[PDB]
Amino acid sequence: NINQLILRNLKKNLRNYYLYVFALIFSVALYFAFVTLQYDPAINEVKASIKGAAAIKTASILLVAVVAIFILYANTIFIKRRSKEIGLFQLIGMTKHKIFRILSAENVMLYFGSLAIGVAAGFSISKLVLMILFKIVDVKADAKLHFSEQALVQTVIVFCGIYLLIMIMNYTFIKKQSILSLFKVTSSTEDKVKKISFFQMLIGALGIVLILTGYYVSSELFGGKFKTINELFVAMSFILGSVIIGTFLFYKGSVTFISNIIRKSKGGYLNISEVLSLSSIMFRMKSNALLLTIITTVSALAIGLLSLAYISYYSSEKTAEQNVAADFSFMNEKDAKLFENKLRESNISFVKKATPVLQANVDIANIMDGTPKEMQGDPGNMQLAVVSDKDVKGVDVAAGEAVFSGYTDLLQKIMVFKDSGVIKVKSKHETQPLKYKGLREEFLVSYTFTSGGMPAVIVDDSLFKQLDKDKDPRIQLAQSTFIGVNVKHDDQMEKANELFQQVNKKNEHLSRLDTSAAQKSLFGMVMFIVGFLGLTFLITSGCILYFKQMGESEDEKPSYTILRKLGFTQGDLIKGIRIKQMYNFGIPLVVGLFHSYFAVQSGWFLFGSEVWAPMIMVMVLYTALYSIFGFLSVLYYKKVIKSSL
Template sequence: MTLFSIARKNIKQNFTNYFLYFASMIFSIVIYFTFVSLKYDETIQATSNASTKISSAFSGAAVVLMIFVAIFIWYSNSFFTRKRKKEVGLYSLLGVRKKQIGRMLFYENFIMGLLALIIGILLGSVLSKFFVSILMKIMGFEAIGEFNISLAAVVNTIIVFSLITILTSFQGYRLIYRFKLIELFQADKEGEQEPKSSFIMALLSILLLGVGYWLALQNILESNVWQMMGFMVAPLVILGTVILGTYFLFSTLTVYLIKMSRKNKKSYWKGVNLVGISQLLYRIKGNARTLTMIAVLSATTLTAVGTAYSLYYNNRSNVELANPNSMMFIDQNKIETNQVKDMISNTKNHEVIYHKSILTLQINADVTTLKNNLFSNEMMYTVISVSDFNKLAKVQKRTDKLSLKGNEAAALDAGYYEGMSPDYVGSTISLKMNDHFENITFKSLKKYNVLNYYTASTTIVVSDQLFTQLGKETNSVDMEVYEITNEDEAKQVTKAIQSVLPDEARFSSFYADYTAGMESSGLLIFIGGFLGLVFLAATGSIIYFKQLTEANSDKGRYEILHKIGVNKKEVKRSISKQVLFVFALPLIVGIAHCSVALTALSRLMHTSLVIPVVICMGVYTCIYIVYYFVTVNAYYKIVTKSK
């Protein structure tokens, strides 16, 4: 019997243990192949105006995915190699040389990798059209791609995963030479020392996390600490304190708390709690690095996916803020203006809700008194009368109504950002007229605009009397404002208007910004979601592998418990508690890190991220729960299986 045939036989006999590793490899290959296929997909290139950006985004995501999958497969393969120490020791005892054993393990891993590659590419090819449809739907397109297989994607995937498989196979080959025969047979019987607990180190973990959280939740524009550290150093300090605090939390604080729980004799001696608590205590410190990595990776994944989904979720409200009107442009030519009016009036799928011609003034102003370092001392404003503001506010169904007199004014700033934007209320600026300055004082600030931002930018509302006076000294600009039904589906009429109006008309539309937002945020959520699933599958698998390794080590202990009268129900309850601790702890810590990060981000963006973030956390937790139950059942079967 050749080494290759032995390797093939071993895979068949151990396929149950290999299954999740094998399935994870297939899943990773499917996702990678999909990403590369989408990069070359003709439907996306023909449909989207941003096909170049999409291709670049998928190329970048594929690189990140490739690096992570390589690390995951490397990590998983080392687990399986170490798990088979006793089997390898038996081969050595029978006289098989390490070189031959290493070759056998190399063949095993290579066969698994090759099978996963073939199945992954076949599944990816079948599912590619489905993934294209999902991406098109998320980005707001109706196009459905034809079934085709990208040869470039197939070659790319084969090269990448062949290299990963060869490297991991050589890793297993190399590990054989590091094992001594006595270590191989005594691997499950090696003595474990009780980890030492330190109240000071436990306190330090809380302190480090507290400092990291506190610094992250500071207002970065007003915080003296951020200004002192600098905007490049502060994020690194946050990252360092949180990661280090997380490691100490798992390696010292949990050990300290578990030791404290042993003092509760009533609970400690109840059932088989003594066994479960002891096993957690002896192994938690050894698992600290793995749990830290999983917690940090979970936090990163949740934050990235939550942010991407938040942008997608809030796209309409953000576009409505920048475009309170469906369409708007500057009237530069009456012929073109009338042509646009006919286009909008005659379109079949849209009705005109309102059409207003707004007289505006484009005036430069000396804004030195606003004392804002982010802006120059001179700015161009669009000036409208208070009567036109009230007219537009009414048709836009706003409850606000301004009343201004003399040189009073109101600022309409849809992009207002507290701490960065000027403090308008109470400030006085000077409007530059032909031969003098006209001072106006801001009476109020509205954090929205009644004119589209791209066309009018920041707008100032003045009294009718002052507007008439200013109009005599500067040129006026007519702006055409339209509101139509089904504005998010106005593709044809928008493109028709864009072909008629020159760039100087500064045409802006709800549809153009809405679709651009859907494209970018949809692409982010698609990439973030799938990368998140890969990360989740990997972290769940790592815990699964570790627990199965420990289950094989604990099999003898549970056999003794069964012999002294402990029933299987109590054994499963003990396993469930033990595995729950290992699964729940990094998940809870990861969610805590994510909550702080997204709270800081929501403050920075001045928007609520609660609903999309809760949805992402809920989905993530549900998938983790599935992994938990699979692990508990696998652990239970191993420790209760009769010889």
């Protein structure tokens, strides 16, 4: 009649059983979504290649390892939570084998029910994220997610293989216990050293060294000795293993040292501001040295993927704006006259600016801080564009001075510019030297006049008065004109663009929105995959943060009804938990930010052409969300305390 007793116990212990099926649900909801993304006909173009296929080989093992570790930790907590019925049954007369069989049967039922439930949860999340990305971000990918049939087999095989590990852990826990230790394991400390134990400092040092060497290897991944598809996979595996192992060894060996050096230096007086902040973490340091690692890893992954997606989007938009150098651009004067005449009856005014250009070659070899290996043309024969001083409304350079323009952040990685020097201008039969002043922050010519991509130069009008007179006719284009069109604040720009398209029959004139659309469409899959994965990992991070809150709130409830009995007010207990919350929400966030910063910096210049503008902007929002979650956690603890007595 054991079954009736177990069901009767379940009818009352419903809180512990609701924190296990939840983990078993969202782990599957994550893994199935990742697999169904991986198996999709539209991704075969991204497949093969050299770099693209290596990512799939390492993600496929990373997600498996993460899910297995999390599920095993949750099961260990679930078993250790009761640990009393087992001892009572052992005293009553059951052998160990019968207890093992009962536990295994219950685990089979619960685990397979949760596996069946979880699959229907991942599909909805995947479709919802797809709807968000296709609707309120407005990207073009032309990809669809279907239910498929290999995904179910891939999920079921792995989640049936995990059951063997779970059963092994349960059996070894049952075997390696005494009939008396089970009674007092629920209220037994885990800090088993109670000393200084300088060995923990050594462990922390090894963790830091491993993290640093992982960072250093990651800094030299692309553009080096890795060329074969069997070489990038090994490097990625080594980096992603070293970082996690280093973080885990850093957390375990550091908290147990600075948390002992504080208590031992007090002798033990412990007013009520530390009994709720230091004693708790000393009680449960060993079980929190593994959850914090998971939180940091998932947060770092989410931040990195979102940062890369935003880099792609922002760089596409900025490059589209950059290639035209103005709102509207024209090649010849007559079509510009047509467009302006058409706008004349459109009740829209235009700012027409004319800037002559003199294409000439100069020497910037001395100011370059790079290497001759990066040729990018003859070292003494960069082709530039020269404009006067009156054409600029922002600066007025003096005589015998040279100023450059343009920023194009990616350019400051191959061509590296030094401080002020001397620039040699070579002409037909004269040599006028100039000396560098600074680099501006704007582009003055379209991509036709910039040749390979180097920006233009601004000189004083006095020198231009004879530079234009000389006008060496050997590298000049068909005509020297940069007639452009500028408009006011946000208005019916689409109407003007439609007029532009209906003007150019041969479509030989540049536009802004068309280039933006082309650039956005050319990177659709690349900006879609990372966004999808980042959003899924963000949701999983939120769920895993919420789970720990309820677990730890329920674990230590009886301690709030003893201190409140002796006389301490409910307004003083809340002053000791803020420290714990600040610690728990300040360590992982900082470590994850460091990981994300050293992760994005080694993988850009494949997704876009700008880093420091979007990367800073994407971390602030995540920090704000994380702080909001922490504030909600503190409010929930306040509500729990109020009802303790």
